[PDB]
Amino acid sequence: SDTHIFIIMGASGDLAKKKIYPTIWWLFRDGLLPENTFIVGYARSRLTVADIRKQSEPFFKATPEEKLKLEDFFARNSYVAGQYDDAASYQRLNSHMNALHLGSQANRLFYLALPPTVYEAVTKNIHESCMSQIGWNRIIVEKPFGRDLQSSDRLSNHISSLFREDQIYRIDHYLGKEMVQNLMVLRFANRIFGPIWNRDNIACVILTFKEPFGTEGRGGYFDEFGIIRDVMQNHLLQMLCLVAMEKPASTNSDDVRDEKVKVLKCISEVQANNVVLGQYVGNPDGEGEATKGYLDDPTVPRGSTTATFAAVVLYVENERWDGVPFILRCGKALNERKAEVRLQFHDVAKRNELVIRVLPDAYERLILDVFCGSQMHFVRSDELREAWRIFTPLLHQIELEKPKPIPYIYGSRGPTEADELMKRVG
Amino acid sequence: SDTHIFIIMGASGDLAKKKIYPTIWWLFRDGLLPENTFIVGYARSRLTVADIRKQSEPFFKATPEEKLKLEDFFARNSYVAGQYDDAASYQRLNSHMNALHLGSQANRLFYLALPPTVYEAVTKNIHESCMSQIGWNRIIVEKPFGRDLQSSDRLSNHISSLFREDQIYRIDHYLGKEMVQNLMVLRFANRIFGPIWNRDNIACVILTFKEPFGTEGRGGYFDEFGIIRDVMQNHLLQMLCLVAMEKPASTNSDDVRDEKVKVLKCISEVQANNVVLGQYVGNPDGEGEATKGYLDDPTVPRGSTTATFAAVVLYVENERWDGVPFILRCGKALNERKAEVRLQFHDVAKRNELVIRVLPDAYERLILDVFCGSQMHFVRSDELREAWRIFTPLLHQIELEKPKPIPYIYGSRGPTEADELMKRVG
Ligand SMILES: NC(=O)c1ccc[n+]([C@@H]2O[C@H](COP(=O)([O-])OP(=O)(O)OC[C@H]3O[C@@H](n4cnc5c(N)ncnc54)[C@H](OP(=O)(O)O)[C@@H]3O)[C@@H](O)[C@H]2O)c1
Ligand SMILES: NC(=O)c1ccc[n+]([C@@H]2O[C@H](COP(=O)([O-])OP(=O)(O)OC[C@H]3O[C@@H](n4cnc5c(N)ncnc54)[C@H](OP(=O)(O)O)[C@@H]3O)[C@@H](O)[C@H]2O)c1
């Protein structure tokens, strides 16, 4: 119908005040939100709507002549306080949601702005207390999708037990404002160059995510995570799919995501001698955050073997590709800020290659994609499992054998051995 | 065999001293010339080899430690003096060429560094006096290939009467050091994207030759010629062919040139309402040659209606293309120095487009291409005729009706109406 509730589970939190409260303001402010939308915060910390505004409006960029819309926005806002495993609380939520205008019939969008240590609990209660009887129910689950296959599996199974895959919006939104455009053009590209993109013409596909800036004083988070999990397993691996996938049956969210998965099921398990891990050390003869290395960051615990740059060769194995090496190369603290897919062709009779680089605005597009109900740019349960199947074995070997990453100087291309790997293949 | 003669017909001239004498030095100097090569100058002006050196070595970039090769080069040089229609002179040439070591058997390369007002004469004499009996004979003919169809036809017929098309090397070499690379990648590109490049995917191909610099004090030459003849009829029209051509039967000089011609025969005659001619006026608020316009050049005769920039729509008409408008856009004194072919695609469910931009070194590659005997990057008699057939009617209408070109400010993109034309089509 025409009435929507946006439940921000964990409204006290950072993602809460710093991204979603604002990002929703910017969709209200420019009337992209369904007209009869309400916002309900739900955490333990006993606070008022006014209280949220005071710490959050800073990040809004409220200009003294839009402040009559804004007043109307906080009029739509409420907050109920309660535990995440206390049916009495989820009760005091669900019954307050019925109070709101047409709440009975209303659509329900649940944003789990909560560390997934509490997902099993929150999901179970939302199921049996809070789900709309008439309205659709959609849960936005946040990274990490677990750390290995075993863990992502155990959790993903808990959620796909309570919720249909068409209610599970897994949101990755951390690699910057253009992050969805990346995925669009690489699909618009599979369409065009489909008949060309074969082992026949192509020798070596390379997908590249460079960032120039460091970990910047938050290395301590990046640490318990690492560059393979932060960029490759999720994003790079996804666009690799968009390149190698077949003609989707249609343009349906599920027909494409099907095709992506089909690619993934035909990649076997990345092995160590196809991988060059690299950690950044600070710059002698530079200035800014570039004098500081990874280990100079005081939130990184002493002597971290954590990869801050990786180069990895995957083979898709079927008729269409095969021998064809996909190279995923990505790093924090490098030379440029580049996101590009290069396809090198067999220069039969200087090698020849094709390159692909990069008003609603990535995160914003994802909040609307979920309200609309297109699951396109979100990862599917089965897509994720396959993704983990691949990297887990390597990842497990690294946690265990704790191999020292190849030092590389801040603002470098990466380690030298990374390029020597690209060549040892094609 | 292993013995070659390079006859520079018109050795006194500019192209003589400023380009070919040097360019051959640079192929001798880096031993790319067949080992037993001789150089013979032939003009009227009674001068010595020494005499050539004095005015020409300046342009050589002779470095005081390669000057033992160089001595050996001028040892290979000679010069015989004679008229261009005096069988007694062509006699004193041909008999002096027999004198040279193995001249009897020798291969003969004739460079017509002569204004084509004398081509009919020189060609006829060379035929009946000078052609090697054993060795191959190749004539390098220089621009202009005439000015209209009637004229290019009358001359081209005179030459294709004395010489097999596999002896007629028509050399265009004036649009800069990378000019052959342009044509290479656009063919390497027809190969790759062949199956894609259809009316199905593509809406609007645009081929673009911008130069930032003026006519620079030599407008007076450009004038009796004009931007359609200087850049479009010849170069742009050629790469249009390389884009739209079919799979050549093989990679033979003649199989490809065949395919190019096939494209051209399927373009009908450019008409005036598909054309935006533009002349540059100098820059008020700039400096250098940019204060000066076209007409401020003192070699341009007062009130010239001469096009210094053109935008033209051609339609290739067959199954493969059709409706598909090729737009050729080119200008002297513009914003950048760009040579690029853009292919815009039908963005089914911001318009999407493919772009193509840009040790032996263009002119150098052409001198060797002719010694080797690959006629690839040279225009064919029949290719040229078709080229002229197209532009002549328009061109004739402009000489006759003398239409004032749209003024455009130096360092501009071109005239505004040029873009309004691109849109009135696609
Ligand atoms: N790239 C990334 O991986 C990335 C970036 C940012 C965040 N995230 C994800 O975003 C989600 C939200 O994190 P956040 O940054 O907003 O901050 P957070 O402070 O970790 O979580 C926000 C709220 O969660 C509650 N909370 C925190 N720790 C808890 C615990 N151990 N037990 C129970 N409740 C707890 C608190 O609510 P109350 O005190 O009010 O009850 C807190 O204000 C997480 O899933 C996180 O993994 C992902
Ligand atoms: N983009 C272009 O269109 C371009 C650029 C440069 C030149 N070209 C072409 O290059 C060729 C050579 O021209 P150039 O620049 O070297 O200079 P040029 O001086 O016009 O010709 C060189 C020599 O030709 C002879 N000559 C000149 N005018 C003559 C006439 N009316 N009758 C008889 N002989 C004559 C003279 O030789 P002697 O006094 O020693 O007998 C002169 O030294 C021409 O075909 C020209 O069209 C093309």
Numbering used by the authors:
A (entry chain A), B (entry chain A): 29 to 377, 386 to 394, 433 to 500
Give sentences copied directly from the paper behind this entry:
pmcGlucose-6-phosphate dehydrogenase (G6PD) is a housekeeping enzyme that generates NADPH. G6PD exists as a monomer, homodimer, and homotetramer, with each monomer having three binding sites: one for catalytic glucose-6-phosphate (G6P), one for an NADP+ cofactor, and an allosteric NADP+-binding site. Oligomerization is central to G6PD function as it controls the activity of G6PD; the monomer is inactive with both the dimer and tetramer being the active forms.
Structurally, lysine 403 (K403), forms an important contact with a phosphate group of the structural NADP+, and studies by Wang et al. revealed that K403 is acetylated in RBCs under physiological conditions. Firstly, and consistent with our hypothesis, the mutation of lysine to glutamine disrupted structural NADP+ binding—no density was observed for structural NADP+. Additionally, no density was observed for the ßM and ßN strands of the structural NADP+-binding site (shown in black on G6PDWT in Fig. 3A), which caused major changes in the globular structure of the dimer (white to salmon). Secondly, major alterations were observed in the αf-helix; the αf-helix was extended, causing a loop to protrude into the G6P-binding pocket. These observations explain our biochemical data; G6P occlusion hinders G6PD activity, and dimer distortion prevents salt-bridge interactions at the tetramer interface, and these findings are consistent with previous structures solved for Class I variants. Interestingly, although G6PDK403Q forms a dimer that is less prone to dissociation, it is inactive and thermally unstable.
